[PDB]
């Protein structure tokens, strides 16, 4: 149960507990008043650095809810292949549309 009005409260394990969809409404629901009584031990700008992590960490965590909706990312480039000594390697920019019934 993190509080965004207390800067020292924000951590990764607090932001990970509330998922992406909760993060969607977690940004608006806060209170306009900010509390400076307890600053951040690493500094207050560490909260914006912390903010990119939770979303990026939830990106690949979001596609897990979509795990049945997507495919495996292929090599998008040559030089990435299992064995090059029989066939050469293409790479696949995914313009296809991952979806599964």
């Amino acid at each position: 149960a993190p509080q965004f009005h207390r800067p020292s409260t924000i951590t990764a394990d607090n932001v990970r507990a509330l998922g992406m969809r909760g993060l969607v409404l977690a940004t608006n629901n806060a209170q306009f008043i900010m509390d400076n009584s307890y600053p951040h031990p690493h500094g207050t700008q560490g909260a914006v650095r912390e903010f990119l992590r939770g979303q990026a960490a939830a990106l690949t965590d979001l596609g897990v809810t979509h795990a049945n909706n997507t495919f495996a990312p292929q090599p998008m480039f040559a030089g990435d292949a299992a064995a090059e000594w029989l066939r050469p390697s293409f790479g696949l920019k995914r313009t296809y549309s991952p979806f599964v019934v």
Partner: protein
């Protein structure tokens, strides 16, 4: 009126840029309504191969949407993307929308072939190619005004110590940094370290070697010092990108949970299950920023933005760099004068001045560095927050380029080249050649 006779002379029929592909370009630079999703994407892609082929699909959607709405080709403000949109995405874009992206690349490569018509064969001199003593664009002594790599900076420094290659990066000498992912942020630092985040895949990385073709840097210069000032008439300005807030409002994700008994909803309006529906909108997320932006992007493709986890970017680093004049021009009387032209590692070029939307602030993501006198707005630099009210008049008259990024009389491109961009009615296709003639060296 002289030069446009010189320039229009060089228009012997080398190459022309189709009139449709012109109006559909100006139609970009001049849109007051231009989707801010496009600016944010460039910040995400930030030039890299690996990032682009990952996000390759999102691009294909955004263009055709914007190409069918306003009928103006997008992503024009960066040549790196325009160089990819030709090579990678072959058949996705309509028959029509490609031709606009072929000509730019073509009509660039047409200008690069003037210089080798006008140079004689000859041995190298200062360690420089013989054409490099003729034309400015072939000079390594310059830099493109926007660089995503350390690669160019390698070559420029490598120029003869006679040509004195230093960099003040936030005020210090060049250092080049390997790659940048989630763990490494470091968006504020003034040190010399410079990312190389643009790499084909995860397997090949270095700071001391380029992965790309030989002419890559030249075509950039030809693009920014010729085409953009030909189309834009100098109404655009460079701006530093703040990577704090970019990925954030990018990694805000409303992607609805899909039920297996359903299909994949494609409709931004009627489908309650497509992330672009007005019910899924929560202020200032991506799918909600598509509402402010009017772009169609699919919920499942929204996922591929995950690859941001696999590559990130640092900041916008101001660079001075110095050079002494040529091996050919260096005389005991000349040797002590230098040329200072600044550049920006990891920066972006704005086009049109949207200051009047209280729904979009000026200083949220992109902050305005007027790099070079070619790049300054009247309505950009004036509409920034905290602009002194006294200079509002004079700001119309002169470029406000701050001396830390270099001044006029020391630069290698003076003022009078600029107004030749504004004051010449020759047209889009007859300026480009007229400019290329301007850039030969004395």
């Amino acid at each position: 009126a002289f030069r446009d006779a010189r320039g229009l002379e060089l228009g012997v029929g080398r190459h022309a840029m189709a009139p449709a592909t012109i109006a559909a370009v100006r139609g970009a630079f001049e849109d007051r309504s231009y989707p801010a999703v496009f600016y944010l994407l460039q910040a995400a892609i930030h030039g890299s191969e690996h990032v682009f082929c990952a996000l390759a699909r999102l691009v294909t959607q955004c263009i055709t949407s914007y190409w069918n709405n306003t009928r103006c080709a997008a992503f024009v403000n960066d040549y790196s993307l325009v160089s990819y949109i030709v090579t990678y995405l072959g058949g996705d874009l309509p028959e029509e929308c490609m031709a606009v992206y072929r000509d730019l690349v073509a009509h660039v490569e047409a200008l690069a072939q003037l210089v080798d018509d006008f140079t004689l064969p000859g041995p190298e001199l200062g360690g420089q190619a013989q054409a490099e003593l003729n034309h400015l664009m072939r000079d390594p002594a310059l830099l493109p005004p926007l660089v995503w790599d350390c690669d160019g900076l390698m070559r420029h420094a490598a120029l003869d110590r006679h040509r004195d290659c230093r960099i003040d990066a936030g005020g210090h000498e060049p250092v080049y940094a390997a790659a940048c992912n989630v763990a490494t942020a470091d968006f504020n630092r003034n040190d010399g370290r410079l990312l190389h985040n643009t790499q084909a895949r995860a397997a090949d990385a270095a700071d001391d070697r380029p992965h790309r073709p030989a002419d890559w840097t030249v075509h950039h210069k030809i693009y920014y010092y010729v085409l953009v000032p030909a189309f834009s008439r100098g109404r655009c300005c460079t701006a530093g990108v703040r990577f704090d807030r970019v990925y954030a409002t990018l990694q805000n994700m409303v992607v609805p949970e899909i039920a297996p008994g359903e299909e994949c909803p494609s409709d931004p309006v009627t489908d309650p299950a497509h992330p672009l529906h007005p019910a899924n909108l929560v202020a200032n997320t991506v799918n909600a920023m598509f509402h402010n932006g009017r772009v169609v992007v699919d919920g499942p493709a929204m996922l591929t933005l995950q690859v941001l986890a696999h590559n990130m970017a640092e900041r916008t680093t101001a660079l001075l760099c110095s050079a002494a004049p040529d091996a050919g021009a260096n005389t005991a009387s000349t040797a002590n004068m230098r040329i200072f032209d600044g550049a920006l590692h990891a920066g972006v070029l704005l086009m049109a001045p949207q200051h009047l939307d209280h729904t979009i602030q000026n200083g949220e993501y992109f902050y305005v560095l007027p790099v070079h006198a070619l790049f300054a707005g009247a309505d950009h630099v004036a509409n920034a927050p905290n602009f002194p009210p006294a200079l509002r008049d004079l700001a119309r008259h002169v470029p406000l380029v701050p001396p830390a990024l270099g001044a006029n009389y020391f630069s290698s491109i003076r003022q009078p080249v600029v107004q030749h961009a504004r004051e010449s009615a020759a047209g889009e296709n007859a300026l480009t050649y007229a400019l290329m003639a301007g850039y030969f060296k004395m």
